[PDB]
Amino acid sequence: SMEQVAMELRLTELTRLLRSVLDQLQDKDPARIFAQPVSLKEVPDYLDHIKHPMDFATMRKRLEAQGYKNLHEFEEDFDLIIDNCMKYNARDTVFYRAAVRLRDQGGVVLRQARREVDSIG
């Protein structure tokens, strides 16, 4: 049907917009602490602590597979990254501090993306 093509022009386009949003969140992590999943070779105990791991390269994979049905799904992944990091790492660490900063700086970017999704459809 043509109504499934028009749906996909909207999914394709959400995916166009969410690409941009990811790029901007990832620029607020210049240290690249959240770029890649936490290594299980280097932290074998990690899944004892963090049941749903998340990172930017993993978000990217899902996005290029049009696997985010809306902005809320995308925002949940982003908060995983931050919240996982804030549990796993103690307060007086470069990792925890990096998450606080990424969250504070991400809020602005997300506040404008919410508006562009509602707006454009």
- Structure resolution in Å? 2.1
Write the single-letter amino acid at 26.
Answer: Q
Q: Please state whether 33 falls in left (phi above 0), alpha (psi between -120 and 50) or beta.
A: alpha
Residue 89: CA atoms inside 13 Å, Cβ hemisphere, count?
Answer: 18
The residues, ordered by sequence, that sit 6+ positions from 62 with a Cβ below 8 Å of its Cβ are: 68, 77
Domain ranges of the chain: 1-121
User: Is the distance from CB of 85 to CB of 23 less than 8 angstroms?
Assistant: no
Cα dihedral sign for 42, 44, 46, 47? positive
Cβ-count burial of 36 within 10 angstroms (0-12 exposed, 13-18 middle, 19+ buried)?
Answer: exposed
Method: X-ray
User: Would you identify the CATH topology of the domain 1-121?
Assistant: Histone Acetyltransferase; Chain A (1.20.920)
